[PDB]
Amino acid sequence: KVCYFTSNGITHIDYKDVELLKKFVSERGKILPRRVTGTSAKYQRKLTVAIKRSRQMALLPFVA
Amino acid sequence: HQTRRWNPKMKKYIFTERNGIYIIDLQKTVKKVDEAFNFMREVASDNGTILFVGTKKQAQESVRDEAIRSGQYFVNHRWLGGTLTNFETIQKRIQHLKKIEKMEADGTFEVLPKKEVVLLKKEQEKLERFLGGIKDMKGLPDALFIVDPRKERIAVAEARKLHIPIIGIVDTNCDPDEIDYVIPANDDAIRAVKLLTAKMADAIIEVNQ
RNA sequence: GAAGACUGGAGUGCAGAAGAGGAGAGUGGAAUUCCACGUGUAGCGGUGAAAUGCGUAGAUAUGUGGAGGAACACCAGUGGCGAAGGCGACUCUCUGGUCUGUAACUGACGCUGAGGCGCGAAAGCGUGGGGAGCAAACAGGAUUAGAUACCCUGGUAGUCCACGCCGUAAACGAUGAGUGCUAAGUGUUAGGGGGUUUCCGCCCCUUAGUGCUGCAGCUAACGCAUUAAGCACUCCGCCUGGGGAGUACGACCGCAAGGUUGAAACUCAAAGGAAUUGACGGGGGCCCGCACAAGCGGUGGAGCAUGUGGUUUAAUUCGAAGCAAC
RNA sequence: AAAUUCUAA
Ligand SMILES: [Mg+2]
Ligand SMILES: [Mg+2]
Ligand SMILES: [Mg+2]
Ligand SMILES: [Mg+2]
Ligand SMILES: [Mg+2]
Ligand SMILES: [Mg+2]
Ligand SMILES: [Mg+2]
Ligand SMILES: [Mg+2]
Ligand SMILES: [Mg+2]
Ligand SMILES: [Mg+2]
Ligand SMILES: [Mg+2]
Ligand SMILES: [Mg+2]
Ligand SMILES: [Mg+2]
Ligand SMILES: [Mg+2]
Ligand SMILES: [Mg+2]
Ligand SMILES: [Mg+2]
Ligand SMILES: [Mg+2]
Ligand SMILES: [Mg+2]
Ligand SMILES: [Mg+2]
Ligand SMILES: [Mg+2]
Ligand SMILES: [Mg+2]
Ligand SMILES: [Mg+2]
Ligand SMILES: [Mg+2]
Ligand SMILES: [Mg+2]
Ligand SMILES: [Mg+2]
Ligand SMILES: [Mg+2]
Ligand SMILES: [Mg+2]
Ligand SMILES: [Mg+2]
Ligand SMILES: [Mg+2]
Ligand SMILES: [Mg+2]
Ligand SMILES: [Mg+2]
Ligand SMILES: [Mg+2]
Ligand SMILES: [Mg+2]
Ligand SMILES: [Mg+2]
Ligand SMILES: [Mg+2]
C-alpha cells in the first residue's frame, strides 16, 4: 500500500545491503512482484538491478 | 451530483466547487424559477392542463400530493411508453378501466364463478397502479413537468416528438436542451422537489383561479 | 526581386531525467545430452489402443565428478527504446537519439521530396569453423477403403559464429510526412510548478508518450472520435470491372534461386464491402422426454410357434428394409 | 487439455 523507498526515504539501493534485499526476495529465492510489495517504478527497476548484481556476487542464492 | 458524472453543457450553471461535488449558483436559479412561474401563469389559464411526471420516489410522493392539491393530471409509477403517442390505445385501456369499475361497483359484484379474485382483481389493481392520473386526462397535455430529466428520457422524447413545451428541474447530470425551458435544481433531496413542485402548482392555481 | 527590422517556427548554450537503442571484449546460474564411478534389479519409453525403439554385455531411477552447445526462469506490466525490420542474464569500453525546465545566444537557417545513396524478420547462396536440443528431405511403426499426412521411435542440411551476397512478408494501425483548430470522464510511464504539512502523505495545475469509454462531426455500414477515419493548407506515392497475369517480349540487378519495370489477343456480365433473418456445425450454454442413476422382471443360454436374408425347387405370390420394416 | 476413423452422390 506504500512504497518503502518513498516512506522510509532511501535514495538508491546499493547491492551490499543484504538485509535490505530480504524484504523483497521470496524465501524460495526469487524477486517478489511489484504488487505484493507495492514498490514504485524507478525503485522497482533499480532494486531488481541491485538484486541481480548481488546474486551474481554469490551474495544471495540463485535457488534455495 | 459528483464532479465525475456531469454534463459539460451545464458549465454555465455551476459555481465554484466544494470538496466532493459541484455547487450550483443560486441567482441564476431564482431568475429561472421566476421565469418559470411567469410561464406557468401564462399557460395555466387556458382551460387546458399541466402534466406531472414523478420519476423518482421523492418526485413520486411530491407530484402525487401536488397534483391532488391542484386537481391536475399526473403520472406517478413507471411511465409506460406511448401515452403521448399511442393515445388511442391508452384511451382504450382507460375506457376498459372505467367500464370494469362501473360494472363491479354497480351491477352484480358476482359474475358467475369464483374467478374474480384470480385475475379480474389483480389485473385491475395493476392497471390502476400504472395509469393513475390518466383516467381523467381528456385531451393532450400542454406542458409536462419532470423532476429528473435524465431518468425520464422516454417521456421527454415522446413530448419533443409531438412538440409541446417542457418544464423541469435539471441537475448537473443532464443535458439542458432536450427540455426547452429549464431551472437548475437538485433532483435528489425530497425537500427541494417538494418546494419547486408546490411553487409550480401554486402559480397554476393563482393564475387559473 | 532588392535593402533593413522582429521572435511566437528551427537550431545552439545552461540545469536535470528515463530507457531490452547499436557495436566489441569478458564472466554467471538453472536445465537437456554425452562420458566415468558406487550399491542397484527387470523392465524403461510411448499412444485414443499398440508396435517400432532402449534393456541381463545389464538399461530407467539413483548420488558424485568432467565436456560441450544453445537460450536467458522470477523481475514482466495494452511497461520502455528505435525511422522501420526489431531489441530481455551480468560487467566494462566505443557510441546514436529523445523528454522536461530557464531565456543566455543566432535570427525564417523551415516542410515535402521524382531520380539517387543506405538499412531491411525468416527462409536461401559462396568460403571456413563449429554442432547440446529441435528438425525440411529420409527410414521404420501405427491409423484408414487408400494415407506420398496428422500420431510414435530415430535423423541429414539448417538453426549458432566471422566475412561477403540476396532484397522479400498479413514488412499491418491493412491508416504517407509537416503544421494549426474543435465537449468531456478515467488508468499508466518520464518530468515541472503550488498548497496542508517538523517530516510522511494527500489535493490542484502544466508538458511529452501510452490505453479504455464518449459528445459535435464524419461513414454504405461496421465504426473513428485531441494518438480523428472531424474542419483546413503544402508536398509525395498510388487506383479506374474480374480473369488472361504479376504471365509473355524488352531492359537492369544477382554466383544461382530469383527481384524491380511490365502489356495485348481472347473471354465473362458480373467479381466485390458492411449487416439482415433463416438454415447448418464432427462450437458452446440452459431446459425436457423411462435418457441415463436405483430397483423389479425379462431377452441372448435349451425346447417350441410365427416373421425375416440366404436356400432349392416349377413357383416357393407381390410389397414394407437403422430408431420410424420383421 | 486429454481423446480412433467415418455421404457418397
Ligand atoms: Mg440529481
Ligand atoms: Mg524553441
Ligand atoms: Mg551441468
Ligand atoms: Mg534425444
Ligand atoms: Mg545416471
Ligand atoms: Mg551430475
Ligand atoms: Mg518512435
Ligand atoms: Mg519482435
Ligand atoms: Mg520518450
Ligand atoms: Mg526513390
Ligand atoms: Mg537466417
Ligand atoms: Mg551457411
Ligand atoms: Mg511485423
Ligand atoms: Mg507510428
Ligand atoms: Mg501494402
Ligand atoms: Mg491521406
Ligand atoms: Mg522524412
Ligand atoms: Mg496528416
Ligand atoms: Mg495520460
Ligand atoms: Mg508521475
Ligand atoms: Mg496523452
Ligand atoms: Mg454518435
Ligand atoms: Mg477502437
Ligand atoms: Mg472511440
Ligand atoms: Mg491510432
Ligand atoms: Mg499507435
Ligand atoms: Mg474516410
Ligand atoms: Mg482487364
Ligand atoms: Mg506494378
Ligand atoms: Mg478481399
Ligand atoms: Mg460477409
Ligand atoms: Mg441393479
Ligand atoms: Mg433361444
Ligand atoms: Mg440354441
Ligand atoms: Mg410390387
XYZ file of C-alpha atoms in Angstrom, chain B residues 93-186:
94
model
C -57.293 0.920 -21.837
C -58.681 3.640 -19.580
C -62.150 3.110 -21.060
C -61.726 -0.553 -20.139
C -60.837 0.565 -16.610
C -63.880 2.827 -16.290
C -66.227 0.124 -17.581
C -64.881 -2.579 -15.271
C -65.007 -0.241 -12.271
C -68.590 0.757 -13.079
C -69.777 -2.822 -13.559
C -68.028 -4.052 -10.402
C -69.399 -1.170 -8.331
C -72.965 -1.303 -9.676
C -74.128 -4.402 -11.494
C -73.656 -7.651 -9.590
C -70.231 -7.860 -7.837
C -70.509 -11.565 -8.733
C -70.481 -12.680 -12.371
C -70.898 -16.463 -12.136
C -67.796 -18.377 -10.948
C -65.216 -17.859 -8.209
C -62.889 -16.423 -10.845
C -62.936 -12.730 -9.918
C -60.084 -12.903 -7.392
C -57.741 -14.992 -9.545
C -57.390 -12.494 -12.370
C -60.169 -9.907 -12.537
C -58.968 -8.120 -9.377
C -55.176 -8.370 -9.692
C -55.153 -7.016 -13.244
C -57.495 -4.170 -12.295
C -55.239 -3.270 -9.363
C -52.103 -3.348 -11.521
C -53.697 -1.252 -14.268
C -54.993 1.279 -11.734
C -51.459 1.455 -10.340
C -49.843 2.076 -13.729
C -52.359 4.512 -15.219
C -53.456 6.628 -12.258
C -53.999 10.218 -13.352
C -54.599 9.295 -16.998
C -58.149 8.293 -16.013
C -59.086 11.993 -16.159
C -56.852 13.282 -18.991
C -59.415 14.389 -21.567
C -57.048 15.537 -24.308
C -53.368 16.302 -24.836
C -51.143 17.792 -22.113
C -49.895 21.317 -22.691
C -46.678 21.314 -20.641
C -45.013 18.336 -18.989
C -43.194 18.667 -15.672
C -40.294 16.298 -14.980
C -38.226 16.012 -11.811
C -35.172 14.193 -13.203
C -34.933 14.640 -16.995
C -32.149 12.076 -17.452
C -34.105 9.420 -15.547
C -37.155 10.051 -17.773
C -35.778 10.030 -21.323
C -38.832 8.281 -22.787
C -41.268 10.954 -21.608
C -39.166 13.879 -22.838
C -38.640 12.143 -26.183
C -42.365 11.498 -26.588
C -43.162 15.116 -25.731
C -40.487 16.524 -28.040
C -41.720 14.416 -30.952
C -45.214 15.887 -30.518
C -43.632 19.338 -29.973
C -45.210 20.515 -26.726
C -43.386 22.645 -24.124
C -41.486 21.009 -21.269
C -40.577 22.418 -17.853
C -38.383 20.550 -15.405
C -35.516 20.710 -12.945
C -32.165 19.751 -14.480
C -29.425 18.597 -12.128
C -25.767 18.856 -13.165
C -26.002 15.397 -14.794
C -28.487 16.292 -17.559
C -28.460 17.960 -20.971
C -30.497 21.209 -20.809
C -31.557 21.274 -24.456
C -33.993 18.380 -24.696
C -36.076 20.275 -22.136
C -36.937 23.584 -23.752
C -37.190 25.726 -20.625
C -35.103 24.870 -17.604
C -34.472 25.525 -13.913
C -31.201 24.247 -12.354
C -32.016 22.316 -9.184
C -31.008 19.183 -7.281
